Protein backbone atom coordinates (compact mmCIF):
# COMPACT_ATOMS: atom_id res chain seq x y z
CA UNK A 1 0.00 0.00 0.00
CA UNK A 2 1.33 3.42 -1.02
CA UNK A 3 1.64 6.39 1.35
CA UNK A 4 -0.01 9.71 0.49
CA UNK A 5 -0.09 13.15 2.11
CA UNK A 6 -3.16 15.38 2.24
CA UNK A 7 -2.35 19.10 2.42
CA UNK A 8 -5.13 19.78 4.93
CA UNK A 9 -2.68 18.34 7.44
CA UNK A 10 -0.39 21.35 6.95
CA UNK A 11 -3.10 23.77 5.85
CA UNK A 12 -1.83 26.66 7.98
CA UNK A 13 1.84 25.84 8.46
CA UNK A 14 3.14 24.99 4.99
CA UNK A 15 2.60 25.44 1.26
CA UNK A 16 2.61 23.15 -1.78
CA UNK A 17 6.25 23.84 -2.64
CA UNK A 18 7.39 22.97 0.89
CA UNK A 19 4.96 20.04 1.17
CA UNK A 20 6.47 18.52 -1.98
CA UNK A 21 10.03 18.93 -0.73
CA UNK A 22 9.35 17.44 2.70
CA UNK A 23 7.03 14.66 1.54
CA UNK A 24 9.58 13.65 -1.10
CA UNK A 25 12.34 13.75 1.51
CA UNK A 26 10.30 11.55 3.84
CA UNK A 27 9.36 8.76 1.45
CA UNK A 28 5.79 9.64 0.47
CA UNK A 29 4.58 8.08 -2.78
CA UNK A 30 1.72 10.52 -3.34
CA UNK A 31 0.28 13.88 -2.41
CA UNK A 32 -3.28 15.18 -2.72
CA UNK A 33 -3.23 18.74 -4.04
CA UNK A 34 -5.72 21.31 -2.75
CA UNK A 35 -7.28 23.33 -5.57
CA UNK A 36 -9.01 25.99 -3.46
CA UNK A 37 -5.81 27.39 -1.96
CA UNK A 38 -2.52 25.48 -2.22
CA UNK A 39 -2.34 25.18 -6.02
CA UNK A 40 -3.41 28.76 -6.82
CA UNK A 41 -0.83 29.98 -4.30
CA UNK A 42 1.90 27.87 -5.87
CA UNK A 43 0.92 29.17 -9.31
CA UNK A 44 1.59 32.74 -8.20
CA UNK A 45 5.31 32.22 -8.80
CA UNK A 46 5.37 28.87 -10.62
CA UNK A 47 3.75 27.44 -13.74
CA UNK A 48 1.81 24.19 -14.05
CA UNK A 49 4.67 22.99 -16.24
CA UNK A 50 7.12 23.64 -13.40
CA UNK A 51 5.04 21.37 -11.19
CA UNK A 52 4.69 18.78 -13.94
CA UNK A 53 8.47 18.86 -14.31
CA UNK A 54 8.92 18.37 -10.57
CA UNK A 55 6.81 15.20 -10.53
CA UNK A 56 8.63 13.93 -13.61
CA UNK A 57 11.94 14.33 -11.77
CA UNK A 58 11.10 13.06 -8.27
CA UNK A 59 9.56 9.92 -6.77
CA UNK A 60 6.40 11.55 -5.43
CA UNK A 61 3.35 11.85 -7.69
CA UNK A 62 -0.04 13.59 -7.51
CA UNK A 63 -2.74 11.16 -6.40
CA UNK A 64 -5.73 13.47 -6.63
CA UNK A 65 -7.03 17.03 -6.75
CA UNK A 66 -8.95 17.81 -3.60
CA UNK A 67 -12.56 18.76 -3.70
CA UNK A 68 -15.00 19.63 -6.41
CA UNK A 69 -17.04 21.15 -3.56
CA UNK A 70 -20.83 20.74 -3.27
CA UNK A 71 -21.57 19.02 -6.58
CA UNK A 72 -25.12 17.82 -5.86
CA UNK A 73 -28.55 19.39 -5.47
CA UNK A 74 -27.48 22.78 -6.83
CA UNK A 75 -29.62 25.26 -8.76
CA UNK A 76 -28.94 26.13 -12.42
CA UNK A 77 -26.24 28.61 -11.43
CA UNK A 78 -24.59 26.33 -8.89
CA UNK A 79 -24.62 23.44 -11.33
CA UNK A 80 -22.89 25.68 -13.87
CA UNK A 81 -20.18 26.51 -11.32
CA UNK A 82 -19.63 22.81 -10.62
CA UNK A 83 -19.39 21.75 -14.27
CA UNK A 84 -17.17 24.68 -15.20
CA UNK A 85 -14.78 23.91 -12.36
CA UNK A 86 -14.67 20.19 -13.10
CA UNK A 87 -13.90 20.83 -16.77
CA UNK A 88 -11.06 23.06 -15.64
CA UNK A 89 -9.79 20.39 -13.26
CA UNK A 90 -9.64 17.93 -16.16
CA UNK A 91 -7.06 20.12 -17.89
CA UNK A 92 -5.05 20.37 -14.67
CA UNK A 93 -5.13 16.58 -14.16
CA UNK A 94 -3.93 16.06 -17.73
CA UNK A 95 -1.02 18.48 -17.35
CA UNK A 96 0.08 17.16 -13.96
CA UNK A 97 -0.82 13.52 -14.54
CA UNK A 98 -3.39 13.38 -11.74
CA UNK A 99 -5.44 10.19 -11.41
CA UNK A 100 -8.31 11.30 -9.16
CA UNK A 101 -10.64 14.20 -8.39
CA UNK A 102 -12.35 14.12 -5.01
CA UNK A 103 -15.97 15.29 -4.92
CA UNK A 104 -17.64 16.62 -1.75
CA UNK A 105 -21.44 16.56 -1.22
CA UNK A 106 -23.53 19.67 -0.63
CA UNK A 107 -23.50 21.00 2.92
CA UNK A 108 -26.70 22.91 3.65
CA UNK A 109 -29.35 23.62 6.28
CA UNK A 110 -32.10 22.75 3.80
CA UNK A 111 -33.96 19.49 4.37
CA UNK A 112 -34.00 17.42 1.19
CA UNK A 113 -35.48 13.92 0.98
CA UNK A 114 -32.91 11.18 0.47
CA UNK A 115 -34.34 10.07 -2.87
CA UNK A 116 -33.90 13.60 -4.21
CA UNK A 117 -30.32 13.76 -2.95
CA UNK A 118 -29.69 10.35 -4.52
CA UNK A 119 -31.21 11.22 -7.90
CA UNK A 120 -29.30 14.51 -8.11
CA UNK A 121 -26.01 13.00 -6.94
CA UNK A 122 -26.33 10.11 -9.39
CA UNK A 123 -27.27 12.38 -12.28
CA UNK A 124 -24.45 14.84 -11.60
CA UNK A 125 -21.82 12.16 -10.98
CA UNK A 126 -22.89 10.47 -14.22
CA UNK A 127 -22.45 13.80 -16.01
CA UNK A 128 -19.04 14.28 -14.42
CA UNK A 129 -18.18 10.71 -15.40
CA UNK A 130 -19.08 11.46 -19.02
CA UNK A 131 -16.80 14.50 -18.92
CA UNK A 132 -13.92 12.60 -17.33
CA UNK A 133 -13.85 9.62 -19.73
CA UNK A 134 -11.80 11.30 -22.48
CA UNK A 135 -9.28 12.31 -19.79
CA UNK A 136 -9.19 8.91 -18.12
CA UNK A 137 -9.62 10.64 -14.75
CA UNK A 138 -11.60 8.98 -11.97
CA UNK A 139 -13.96 10.61 -9.48
CA UNK A 140 -13.88 9.75 -5.79
CA UNK A 141 -16.94 10.68 -3.78
CA UNK A 142 -15.98 11.61 -0.23
CA UNK A 143 -19.08 11.47 1.95
CA UNK A 144 -18.70 13.78 4.95
CA UNK A 145 -19.76 12.68 8.43
CA UNK A 146 -21.39 15.99 9.33
CA UNK A 147 -25.08 16.52 10.30
CA UNK A 148 -25.39 19.22 7.64
CA UNK A 149 -23.88 17.22 4.77
CA UNK A 150 -26.49 15.79 2.39
CA UNK A 151 -24.53 12.53 1.99
CA UNK A 152 -23.10 11.70 5.41
CA UNK A 153 -22.96 7.90 5.81
CA UNK A 154 -21.17 5.09 4.01
CA UNK A 155 -24.22 3.15 2.84
CA UNK A 156 -25.92 6.25 1.43
CA UNK A 157 -22.77 7.20 -0.49
CA UNK A 158 -22.18 3.61 -1.60
CA UNK A 159 -25.75 3.31 -2.89
CA UNK A 160 -25.17 6.44 -4.97
CA UNK A 161 -21.92 5.12 -6.42
CA UNK A 162 -23.36 1.68 -7.14
CA UNK A 163 -26.30 3.31 -8.90
CA UNK A 164 -24.00 5.48 -11.04
CA UNK A 165 -22.34 2.18 -11.97
CA UNK A 166 -19.31 3.68 -13.75
CA UNK A 167 -15.75 2.32 -13.56
CA UNK A 168 -14.52 5.90 -13.10
CA UNK A 169 -16.79 6.75 -10.15
CA UNK A 170 -15.89 5.46 -6.71
CA UNK A 171 -15.50 6.45 -3.08
CA UNK A 172 -13.11 8.15 -0.71
CA UNK A 173 -13.38 6.24 2.56
CA UNK A 174 -12.37 8.68 5.29
CA UNK A 175 -12.23 6.97 8.70
CA UNK A 176 -13.30 10.13 10.54
CA UNK A 177 -16.29 10.65 8.26
CA UNK A 178 -17.27 6.99 8.57
CA UNK A 179 -17.14 7.29 12.36
CA UNK A 180 -18.52 10.86 12.61
CA UNK A 181 -22.15 10.03 11.75
CA UNK A 182 -21.97 6.39 12.81
CA UNK A 183 -21.64 4.41 9.59
CA UNK A 184 -22.10 0.65 10.07
CA UNK A 185 -18.95 -1.44 9.72
CA UNK A 186 -21.05 -4.29 8.31
CA UNK A 187 -21.90 -2.03 5.37
CA UNK A 188 -18.21 -1.66 4.55
CA UNK A 189 -17.54 -5.39 4.95
CA UNK A 190 -20.22 -6.12 2.33
CA UNK A 191 -18.86 -3.52 -0.11
CA UNK A 192 -16.96 -4.08 -3.36
CA UNK A 193 -13.36 -3.14 -2.58
CA UNK A 194 -12.82 -2.00 -6.16
CA UNK A 195 -15.29 0.85 -5.57
CA UNK A 196 -13.00 2.34 -2.90
CA UNK A 197 -10.56 4.62 -4.74
CA UNK A 198 -8.89 6.45 -1.87
CA UNK A 199 -8.61 5.81 1.84
CA UNK A 200 -8.22 8.89 4.05
CA UNK A 201 -6.82 7.98 7.45
CA UNK A 202 -7.17 10.04 10.63
CA UNK A 203 -8.71 9.62 14.09
CA UNK A 204 -10.74 11.71 16.54
CA UNK A 205 -11.53 12.92 20.03
CA UNK A 206 -14.42 10.91 21.47
CA UNK A 207 -17.37 13.30 21.09
CA UNK A 208 -20.79 11.84 20.14
CA UNK A 209 -21.81 11.68 16.48
CA UNK A 210 -23.47 14.93 15.46
CA UNK A 211 -21.05 16.96 17.59
CA UNK A 212 -17.94 15.91 15.67
CA UNK A 213 -16.33 18.40 13.28
CA UNK A 214 -13.04 18.18 11.36
CA UNK A 215 -11.09 20.17 13.95
CA UNK A 216 -11.67 17.27 16.38
CA UNK A 217 -9.47 14.90 14.37
CA UNK A 218 -6.22 13.66 15.90
CA UNK A 219 -3.31 11.58 14.53
CA UNK A 220 -4.17 8.00 13.46
CA UNK A 221 -4.19 5.73 16.51
CA UNK A 222 -4.33 8.52 19.09
CA UNK A 223 -8.13 8.71 19.07
CA UNK A 224 -11.35 6.76 19.47
CA UNK A 225 -11.97 5.43 15.96
CA UNK A 226 -12.03 1.65 15.63
CA UNK A 227 -9.31 1.78 12.98
CA UNK A 228 -8.71 -1.95 13.50
CA UNK A 229 -12.22 -2.57 12.17
CA UNK A 230 -11.77 -0.17 9.25
CA UNK A 231 -8.42 -1.66 8.22
CA UNK A 232 -9.58 -5.24 8.71
CA UNK A 233 -12.64 -4.52 6.57
CA UNK A 234 -10.66 -2.82 3.79
CA UNK A 235 -8.28 -5.77 3.70
CA UNK A 236 -11.16 -8.25 3.67
CA UNK A 237 -12.85 -6.59 0.69
CA UNK A 238 -9.69 -6.29 -1.38
CA UNK A 239 -8.68 -2.65 -1.05
CA UNK A 240 -4.94 -2.03 -0.70
CA UNK A 241 -3.77 0.63 -3.14
CA UNK A 242 -3.18 3.72 -1.00
CA UNK A 243 -3.70 5.57 2.28
CA UNK A 244 -3.59 9.37 2.61
CA UNK A 245 -3.31 11.14 5.97
CA UNK A 246 -5.74 14.06 6.32
CA UNK A 247 -5.96 16.22 9.46
CA UNK A 248 -7.73 19.54 10.16
CA UNK A 249 -6.59 20.03 13.76
CA UNK A 250 -5.57 23.59 14.75
CA UNK A 251 -3.18 22.15 17.34
CA UNK A 252 -1.02 20.51 14.68
CA UNK A 253 -0.67 23.71 12.68
CA UNK A 254 1.51 24.89 15.56
CA UNK A 255 4.11 22.32 14.49
CA UNK A 256 6.66 23.01 11.77
CA UNK A 257 5.75 21.66 8.34
CA UNK A 258 8.33 18.90 8.69
CA UNK A 259 7.26 17.86 12.20
CA UNK A 260 3.69 17.53 10.96
CA UNK A 261 4.68 15.64 7.83
CA UNK A 262 6.93 13.26 9.77
CA UNK A 263 4.37 12.69 12.51
CA UNK A 264 1.63 12.12 9.93
CA UNK A 265 3.82 9.43 8.39
CA UNK A 266 4.87 7.64 11.57
CA UNK A 267 1.40 7.49 13.09
CA UNK A 268 -0.12 6.38 9.78
CA UNK A 269 2.53 3.76 9.01
CA UNK A 270 2.54 2.36 12.53
CA UNK A 271 -1.23 1.85 12.44
CA UNK A 272 -1.70 0.71 8.84
CA UNK A 273 1.34 -1.60 8.61
CA UNK A 274 -0.30 -3.90 11.15
CA UNK A 275 -2.72 -4.90 8.38
CA UNK A 276 -0.97 -4.04 5.11
CA UNK A 277 2.54 -4.46 3.77
CA UNK A 278 3.81 -1.00 2.89
ZN1 LIG B 1 -10.96 12.97 3.90
UniProtKB/Swiss-Prot annotation:
Function: Involved in the reversible interconverion of 2-keto-myo-inositol (2KMI, inosose or 2,4,6/3,5-pentahydroxycyclohexanone) to 1-keto-D-chiro-inositol (1KDCI or 2,3,5/4,6-pentahydroxycyclohexanone).
A Pfam cross-reference name: AP_endonuc_2
Residues annotated for a divalent metal cation binding in this entry: 142, 174, 200, 246
Requisite cofactors: Mn(2+); Fe(2+); Co(2+)
Catalytic activity: scyllo-inosose = scyllo-inosine
GO molecular function, one term: metal ion binding
InterPro entries: IolE/XylAMocC-like (IPR050312), Xyl_isomerase-like_sf (IPR036237), Xyl_isomerase-like_TIM-brl (IPR013022)
Protein name per UniProt: Inosose isomerase
Top-rank lineage group of the source organism: Bacteria
PANTHER family: HYDROXYPYRUVATE ISOMERASE (PTHR12110), XYLOSE ISOMERASE-LIKE TIM BARREL DOMAIN-CONTAINING PROTEIN (PTHR12110:SF21)
Entry similarity comment: Belongs to the IolI family.
EC number: 5.3.99.11
Residues in the signal sequence: none
Pathway(s) where this gene product acts: Polyol metabolism; myo-inositol degradation into acetyl-CoA
Amino acid sequence: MKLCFNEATTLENSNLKLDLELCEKHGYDYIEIRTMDKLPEYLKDHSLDDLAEYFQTHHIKPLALNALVFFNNRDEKGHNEIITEFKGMMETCKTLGVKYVVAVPLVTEQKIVKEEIKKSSVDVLTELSDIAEPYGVKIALEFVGHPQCTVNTFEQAYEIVNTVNRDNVGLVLDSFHFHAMGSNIESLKQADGKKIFIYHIDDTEDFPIGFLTDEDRVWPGQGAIDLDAHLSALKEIGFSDVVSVELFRPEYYKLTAEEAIQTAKKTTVDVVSKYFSM
